[PDB]
């Protein structure tokens, strides 16, 4: 869950 | 400058005292007699705030004062080792090996500075790590994160490779030592970088200057990505949701560059005719494709991501 809150992060454009 | 701790003529004055003292001491228990290192630990002038510059610190803008650094920890007990890395800590702006490994204040340094740069990285922080690992305590890393926070532009320190790497060896260090008093001191370290962690990378033109000089086909940014390591591993969720934005544009550079020496490694590879040299070719992109990889999981694993099959995933 922390893992696919900061993947979010890395698909910011 | 120089001047601002006595001149050059009397720090390298100081520097031969410090040789006399060592190799006396060093005579003494080789022939197996007594030693009393007051003379040596006097000579060093680390209590002396007679100068704007200790003295001290300005020693170490000399090769001979590096270099005799191991030898000086032989005869030393551990408060006198502590008030050294105090010292160093609470200067690490004045001192000239961090002026002349920033980028910002050496955008072109010559090869006798890179040179002078290594030979500081070998023994210094190879000292500094053996002591930490061996003879400090939770209060006395505090101390010196502390020491390193309060008296110097963090940020700057951060634009030089041996500052970064100091400030990842206390980090890595109180991590090991297990609400605490860490996690408030990481906090204020993590304070005096927000919105600046992108400057821990060099400018491309500094990075082009190093390789010529070098002979590197490739910068070495692994310490960059062994700092970010650190720095996201001791962090919460929200440390880490700011380091992972303001580092993207970095982690994309480094998965195009891995992609880019993939696409080469495959268009040679299935070339026919293979001489010893395009083998060597061929040995020298998977050599810098796998270091780039593995590089950058060294950061992601520490965040439970992955980059693998040309995508960041989640691990396990
Ligand atoms: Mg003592």
Same mark, same amino acid.
Not at chain 2, 42 to 50: G, K, P, R, T, V
């Given at each position: 869950?922390?893992?696919?809150?900061?993947?979010?992060?890395?698909?910011?454009? | 400058?120089?001047?601002? !701790?006595?001149?050059?003529?009397?720090?390298?004055?100081?520097?031969?005292?410090?040789?006399?003292?060592?190799?006396?001491?060093?005579?003494?228990?080789?022939?197996?007699?007594?030693?009393?290192?007051?003379?040596?630990?006097?000579?060093?002038?680390?209590?002396?705030? !007679?100068?704007?510059?200790?003295?001290?610190?300005?020693?170490?803008?000399?090769?001979?004062?590096?270099?005799?650094?191991?030898?000086?920890?032989?005869?030393?007990?551990?408060?006198?080792?502590?008030?050294?890395?105090?010292?160093?800590?609470?200067?690490?702006?004045?001192?000239?090996?961090?002026?002349?490994?920033?980028?910002?204040?050496?955008?072109?340094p010559t090869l006798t500075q890179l040179k002078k740069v290594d030979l500081f990285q070998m023994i210094?922080?190879?000292?500094?790590?053996?002591?930490?690992?061996?003879?400090?305590?939770?209060?006395?890393?505090?101390?010196?994160?502390?020491?390193?926070?309060?008296?110097?532009?963090?940020?700057?320190?951060?634009? !030089?490779?041996?500052?970064?790497?100091?400030?990842?060896?206390?980090?890595?260090?109180?991590?090991?030592?297990?609400?605490?008093?860490?996690?408030?001191?990481?906090?204020?370290?993590?304070?005096?970088?927000?919105?600046?962690?992108?400057?821990?990378?060099?400018?491309?033109?500094?990075?082009?200057?190093?390789?010529?000089?070098?002979?590197?086909?490739?910068?070495?940014?692994?310490?960059?990505?062994?700092?970010?390591?650190?720095?996201?591993?001791?962090?919460?969720?929200?440390?880490?949701?700011?380091?992972?934005?303001?580092?993207?544009?970095?982690?994309?550079?480094?998965?195009?560059?891995?992609?880019?020496?993939?696409?080469?490694?495959?268009?040679?590879?299935?070339?026919?005719?293979?001489?010893?040299?395009?083998?060597?070719?061929?040995? !020298?992109?998977?050599?810098?494709?796998?270091?780039?990889?593995?590089?950058?999981?060294?950061?992601?694993?520490?965040?439970?991501?992955?980059?693998?099959?040309?995508?960041?995933?989640?691990?396990?």
């Amino acid at each position: 869950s922390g893992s696919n809150e900061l993947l979010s992060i890395l698909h910011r454009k | 400058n120089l001047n601002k !701790s006595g001149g050059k003529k009397f720090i390298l004055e100081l520097i031969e005292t410090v040789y006399e003292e060592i190799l006396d001491l060093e005579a003494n228990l080789r022939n197996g007699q007594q030693t009393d290192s007051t003379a040596m630990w006097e000579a060093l002038h680390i209590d002396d705030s !007679s100068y704007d510059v200790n003295p001290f610190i300005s020693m170490l803008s000399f090769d001979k004062g590096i270099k005799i650094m191991p030898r000086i920890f032989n005869f030393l007990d551990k408060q006198q080792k502590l008030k050294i890395l105090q010292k160093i800590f609470n200067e690490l702006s004045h001192l000239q090996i961090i002026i002349l490994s920033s980028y910002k204040t050496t955008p072109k340094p010559t090869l006798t500075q890179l040179k002078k740069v290594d030979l500081f990285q070998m023994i210094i922080l190879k000292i500094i790590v053996s002591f930490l690992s061996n003879n400090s305590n939770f209060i006395e890393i505090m101390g010196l994160l502390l020491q390193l926070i309060r008296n110097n532009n963090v940020s700057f320190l951060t634009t !030089s490779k041996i500052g970064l790497n100091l400030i990842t060896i206390l980090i890595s260090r109180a991590a090991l030592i297990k609400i605490s008093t860490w996690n408030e001191i990481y906090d204020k370290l993590f304070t005096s970088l927000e919105s600046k962690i992108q400057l821990i990378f060099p400018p491309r033109e500094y990075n082009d200057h190093i390789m010529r000089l070098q002979n590197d086909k490739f910068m070495d940014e692994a310490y960059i990505w062994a700092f970010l390591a650190s720095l996201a591993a001791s962090g919460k969720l929200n440390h880490q949701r700011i380091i992972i934005d303001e580092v993207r544009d970095e982690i994309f550079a480094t998965i195009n560059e891995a992609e880019t020496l993939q696409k080469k490694e495959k268009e040679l590879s299935v070339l026919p005719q293979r001489s010893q040299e395009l083998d060597t070719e061929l040995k !020298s992109i998977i050599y810098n494709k796998e270091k780039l990889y593995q590089d950058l999981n060294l950061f992601l694993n520490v965040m439970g991501l992955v980059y693998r099959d040309g995508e960041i995933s989640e691990l396990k």
